[PDB]
């Protein structure tokens, strides 16, 4: 298992503009297009992201090209961030995947706000991190997905995804 398979499970694949769990226009593998209520603003972000006239639909290849870019951007965002990088460098490879999942989902600003959890992850207090991560809007809005990510941080295995 790897970050690409993890995120494909958590996010799904849709070839047509759709609204995410928050009501935002989204396409592909969790690629957020816009927070604006306008479907026209979303289509126009879509054409710009892809470099053609999509008319709100994209192929599998294009969805996967966006996906690759977003994973890459999530990683590079972790490495440039002063709060995130020390935590990340300290984790093993499975639990790095879980940090990328969270950043992909909620942006580096979001994750960097999980201060107490970050500190516990850094000290390798797995069970206490899991409890603290659970006390969050993120866990209450998307519990199934949040449990899978939390379990990964707690156990350092891919079990929740198998
Ligand atoms: Cl883009
Ligand atoms: Cl969920």
Q: How far is the CA of 142 from the centre of ligand 2 (A)?
A: 4
Structural domain count, the chain: 1
The technique is X-ray
Residue 68 is classified by DSSP as H
- What residues sit around ligand 2, an ion, with C-beta below 5 angstroms? 142, 144-145
The whole domain housing 29 covers 1-162
Measure the CA–CA gap between 44 and 53, rounded to whole angstroms: 9
User: How far is residue 151 from each of residues 13, 60, 123, measured CA to CA in Å?
Assistant: 23, 30, 17
**Annotation marks residue 20 as catalytic:** yes
Which ligand number lies closest to the CA of residue 72?
1
Q: Which two tokens stand for residue 10?
A: 């958590």
Tell me the structure's resolution in angstroms, rounded to a single decimal: 2.4
CA-CA-CA-CA torsion sign (93, 94, 100, 106): negative
Q: How far is the CA of 49 from the centre of ligand 1 (A)?
A: 4
Identify the residue whose tokens are 């995120």. 7
Which CATH number belongs to the domain containing residue 22 in this structure?
Answer: 1.10.530.40
């Amino acid at each position: 298992m790897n970050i690409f398979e993890m995120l494909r499970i958590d996010e799904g694949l849709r070839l047509k503009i759709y609204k995410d769990t928050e009501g935002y226009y989204t396409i592909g593998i969790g690629h957020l297009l816009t927070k604006s209520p306008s479907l026209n603003a979303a289509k126009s972000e879509l054409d710009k992201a892809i470099g053609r006239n999509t008319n709100g639909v994209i192929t599998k290849d294009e969805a996967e090209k966006l996906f690759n870019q977003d994973v890459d951007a999530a990683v590079r965002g972790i490495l440039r961030n002063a709060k995130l990088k020390p935590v990340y460098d300290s984790l093993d490879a499975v639990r790095r995947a879980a940090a990328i999942n969270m950043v992909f989902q909620m942006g580096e600003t979001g994750v960097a706000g999980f201060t107490n959890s970050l500190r516990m992850l850094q000290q390798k207090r797995w069970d206490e991190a899991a409890v603290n991560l659970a006390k969050s809007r993120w866990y209450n809005q998307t519990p199934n997905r949040a449990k899978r990510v939390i379990t990964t941080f707690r156990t350092g295995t891919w079990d929740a995804y198998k």
